[PDB]
């Protein structure tokens, strides 16, 4: 049982597939972060000719790229800037699938070169007060899966109620993906990038480095030879610490 990203674009069909167990449970799909309470490069423009030859605009040597800042619309390379991935939503070809013990997860729908942008991890951005409120609510509902992602000390991204398919990436003690923090329009975002060549059909995983505040830690089914056995590891941390202090 698996689906493509566009199956998530039609809430009605999504909803009925969910009742048949054909899609994960419903959540609100959003194209970019939403704050619960609100708060140029030096590349030489690529010639028309060099672009037909297939050269790259804002490639490895772009100054914004190297600092993990995306270019604006005012970029010297204009429409041709390749350093706009988050804003252009140019994600990897990825599928959502039902795993054996982890719930739903993400699968590569074709070969993914090393260091390929996968998806942005989007959600409602929480401050400490909202974080703690949601901690309680989720504990109280008895949620199994957890979606909190530390962004910066006062900012947690909560993908529980709202987000995109990124909320499905499972943890692995030997992951093929990693988080990167990218600056887009003065604002900080997180996205997943492959850490190596990922053959078509393989599950996409990252290392959560999970900071667990719960009494009991969830067991890890990653199946890695080095598996640490639990999500969050050995230590339990305080809620304030998990939350960034």
């Amino acid at each position: 049982p698996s689906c493509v990203m566009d199956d998530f674009r039609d809430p009605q069909r999504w909803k009925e597939c969910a009742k048949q167990g054909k899609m994960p449970c419903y959540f609100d799909l959003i194209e970019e972060n939403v704050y619960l309470t609100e708060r140029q490069c030096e590349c030489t423009p690529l010639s028309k000719d060099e672009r037909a030859q297939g050269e790259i605009a804002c490639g490895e040597d772009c100054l914004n790229r190297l600092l993990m800042i995306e270019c604006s619309s005012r970029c010297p390379n204009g429409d041709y800037c390749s350093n706009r991935r988050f804003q252009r939503k140019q994600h990897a070809d990825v599928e959502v699938i039902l795993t054996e013990k982890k719930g739903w997860g993400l699968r590569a729908a074709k070969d993914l070169p090393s260091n390929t942008f996968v998806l942005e991890y989007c959600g409602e951005v929480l401050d400490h007060k909202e974080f703690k409120a949601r901690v309680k609510e989720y504990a109280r509902n008895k949620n199994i899966h957890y979606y909190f992602m530390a962004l910066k000390n006062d900012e947690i991204i909560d993908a529980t109620q709202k987000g995109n398919c990124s909320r499905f990436m499972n943890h692995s003690c030997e992951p093929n993906c990693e988080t990167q923090k990218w600056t887009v329009n003065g604002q900080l975002r997180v996205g997943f990038f492959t850490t190596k060549l990922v053959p078509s059909g393989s599950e996409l995983t990252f290392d959560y480095q999970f900071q667990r505040y719960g009494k009991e830690a969830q067991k890890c089914f990653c199946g890695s030879a080095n598996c640490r056995g639990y999500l969050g590891g050995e230590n339990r941390v305080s809620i304030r610490a998990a939350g960034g202090k």
């Binding site: 901690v135 309680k136 989720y138 504990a139 008895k142 949620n143 199994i144 957890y146 909190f148 992602m149 530390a150 962004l151 947690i156 943890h171 992951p175 990693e178 988080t179 990167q180 923090k181 997180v190 850490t195 290392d207 959560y208 480095q209 999970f210 900071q211 667990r212 505040y213 719960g214 009494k215 009991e216 830690a217 969830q218 999500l231 969050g232 941390v237 809620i239 998990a242 939350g243 960034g244």
Partner: peptide
Amino acid sequence: APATGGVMKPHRYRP
């Protein structure tokens, strides 16, 4: 109090 829960912590992959 919470039986289960926690936060995913972004970090760069190092081998």
